Amino acid sequence: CGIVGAIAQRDVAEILLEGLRRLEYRGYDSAGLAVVDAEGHMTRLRRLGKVQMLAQAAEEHPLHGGTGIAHTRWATHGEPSEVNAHPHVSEHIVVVHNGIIENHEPLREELKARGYTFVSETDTEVIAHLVNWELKQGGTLREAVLRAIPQLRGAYGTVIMDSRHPDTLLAARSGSPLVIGLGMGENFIASDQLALLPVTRRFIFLEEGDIAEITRRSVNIFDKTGAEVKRQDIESNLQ
Amino acid sequence: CGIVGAIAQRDVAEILLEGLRRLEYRGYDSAGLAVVDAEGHMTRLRRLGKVQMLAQAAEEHPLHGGTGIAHTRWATHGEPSEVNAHPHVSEHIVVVHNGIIENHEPLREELKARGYTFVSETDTEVIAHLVNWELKQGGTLREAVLRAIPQLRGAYGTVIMDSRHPDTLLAARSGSPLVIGLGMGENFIASDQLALLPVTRRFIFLEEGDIAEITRRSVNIFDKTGAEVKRQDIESNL
Ligand SMILES: N[C@@H](CCC(=O)O)C(=O)O
Ligand SMILES: N[C@@H](CCC(=O)O)C(=O)O
Ligand code: NA
Ligand code: NA
């Protein structure tokens, strides 16, 4: 239900937690985050419960790394539990997701035949294993995500990262909002601009069907056929 | 003329240079910056001429480090030259300064007598040598600055760092404006809030006579008797 992501030189865990504090929708049930450092070391922490519980856990095990994604969940598929909380993983592929993957069943079956173990009951987890699958077929994360997204049906927003290549985040808007926040030598993404105001006031709103490749220094947006599209940045005057 | 400073986890050179670009409208003859990394390695680059010239040189000497100060100068003491541009140094003490130190002559002679060599013709350089002097007497950078400031007369603002302890910046407002910009796990300072808008919208204005010690995580403000004062932070989108 709430997504925040960041790709920066500085540690982003505190920015992600502050973003989640700004995305605490009535009835959400769990929260989690994953950060990866420059050497590809990933730390993921999830909790059934409130962002404050996650924040307290993060205080104990300080999470270093300039690339990360975080999520508050409002469960639709799978009961609230830490196992089902986001980020979900498929080895090096880490995903957070808002909305629903309608065709999760057939997809889950295909991936199971490809040798993938599902550990959660969520529709989300199919996104992770599928991008893992596509990436195995060769190409960059952007290319794999371009192949993946058409296979997914439903109303969703997702941000994906590959812990082996922590210099890029991929994001796709396909029935649920996402907005990019532009920083200086760092970039952010959230499902609501309100999450990002502490660190930037300049935004690019993704449009329906947009897939964005975000690095510390560049934002490149494409549609599903892989065509590059131009989206305007705007300065927000909200406090 | 324009001052920008930053103390962050990320490299700050780009933020400093952008801050200077935002200050060019005030006019200036030279500009410079200094950044220090976590290990105390200081890189200083100065140019007679435009910020764009400095930014170009920075592109060849990519400056790494999370603590730094930068300045555009409008010369009052000493002709425009790279030697007279700030930041000025005294070994590990590095200073940028707006305004004038009216009593620079007596202090310069005093510090010359004390063994310092002045490389520049600026009043500014006395600040660097004086803080270096006071620090030799013992204490923290904050303590040394508290002892230095009362010796200076003039209408000025200054930001000071010690490359040996890159986790703190000291700033003193004594007749020329300075504003702190509050970030998340980083803090900034400038002579004009316009310099800081790209990175934050929350500010604390230093009041006359305030001496601030700024770290990545905290801002502690004192008066000249060393008393802690509380200043209000305000949000200001321009
Ligand atoms: N359907 C996903 C995401 C729900 C949401 O948008 O929070 C889940 O149940 O985990
Ligand atoms: N008096 C100092 C500072 C001038 C300024 O405020 O730019 C100098 O001449 O370098
Ligand atoms: Na869709
Ligand atoms: Na004064």
Collapsed DSSP state (helix, strand, coil) of residue B108? helix
Q: Give the C-alpha separation, A156 to A101, whole Å.
A: 7
Q: Is A111 left (phi over 0), alpha (psi -120 to 50) or beta?
A: alpha
Encoded tokens for B168: 């703190």
CB contact under 8 A, B184 and A18: yes
| CB contact burial A143-167 (16+ within 10 A = b; e otherwise) | bbbbbbbebbeeebbbbbbbbeebb
Name where chain A breaks: residue before each gap, C-N > 2.5 Å: none
Contact B158, B101 (CB under 8 A): no
Q: Would you state the structure tokens that stand for residue A64, as one six-digit string?
A: 């270093």
Collect all residues with Cβ–Cβ distance below 8 Å to B225 and sequence separation of at least 6.
none
Experimental resolution (Å): 1.8
* β-strand partners of B154: B101
The CATH number linked to A19 is 3.60.20.10
Contacts of A10 in chain B (CB under 8 A): 8-10, 185-186
Of A146, A162, A153, nearest to A107 by C-alpha is A153
> Is A197 exposed, middle or buried (CB count within 10 Å of its CB: 0-12, 13-18, 19+)?
buried
- Structural domain for A51, as ranges: 1-239
- Is A172 annotated in the active site? no
Instruction: Name the token pair of A67.
Output: 């690339």
In the reported structure, the alpha carbon of residue A153 is separated from the centroid of ligand 3 by a whole-number distance in angstroms of 5
Q: Where are the alpha helices (DSSP H) in chain A?
A: 13-21, 51-60, 104-113, 124-136, 141-148
Q: Number of CB pairs < 8 Å for A and B?
A: 35
The phi, psi pair for A203, rounded to 5°, reads -130, 150
- Contact A15/B184, CB-based, under 8 Å? yes
B185 near A CB under 8 A: yes
**Chain B residues within an 8 Å CB radius of A183:** 199
Report how this structure was experimentally obtained. Answer: X-ray
**B182 in contact with chain A, both atoms CB, cutoff 8 A:** no
Distance between CA atoms of residues B91 and B93, nearest Å = 6
Give the gap in angstroms from C-alpha A9 to the nearest C-alpha of chain B.
6
- A123: Cβ below 6 Å to ligand 1? yes
Three-state helix/strand/coil letters over B8-28 = CCCCCHHHHHHHHHHHHHHCC
Q: Please state the domain count of chain A.
A: 1
CA separation for the pair A232, A235 (Å, rounded): 10
Task: Determine the distance in angstroms separating the CA of B187 from the nearest CA of chain A, rounded to an integer.
Answer: 12
Length of chain B: 238
Segments in B45-172 forming alpha helices (H): 51-58, 104-113, 124-136, 141-148
3-state secondary structure of B203: strand
User: Quick check: B214 and B168 in contact, CB under 8 A?
Assistant: yes
Between CA B104 and CA B130 the distance in angstroms is 11
C-alpha A98/C-alpha A159 separation (Å) is 9
Whole-Å CA distances, B59 to A10, B13, B38, B45: 21, 10, 21, 11
CB atoms within 10 A of CB A43: 18
Please give the number of the atom of ligand 2 that sits closest to the Cα of B156: 6
Indicate yes or no: CB of A184 within 8 angstroms of CB of B237.
no
A14 touches chain B (CB under 8 A): yes
- Separation in Å, CA of B98 to nearest CA in chain A: 26
Distance, CA of B191 to CA of B157 (rounded, Å): 8
| Residue partners of B58: CB distance under 8 A and separation at least 6 | B13, B17, B33, B45
Q: How close are the terminal C-alpha atoms of chain A, in Å?
A: 22
- Ligand 3 center from residue A156 Cα (angstroms): 6
Answer for the pair A214, A7: CB distance below 8 angstroms, yes or no.
yes
Q: What angle do CA A224, A230, A234 make, to 5 degrees?
A: 125
CA of B211: how far to CAs of A184, B145, B174, B178, B198, in Å? 29, 8, 9, 10, 25
Of B8, B14, B198, the CB nearest to A10: B8
The residue count of chain A comes to 239
Ligand sitting nearest the alpha carbon of A76: 1
Cβ–Cβ contact B235 with A under 8 A: yes
Helix (H, G, I), strand (E, B) or coil at A86: coil
Token pair listed for A88: 């979900």
Q: Quote the CA–CA distance of A140 and A68 in Å, as a whole number.
A: 19
> Which of A151, A90, A144 has its CA nearest to residue A117?
A90
A11 to chain B: which residues are within 8 Å by CB? 9, 185
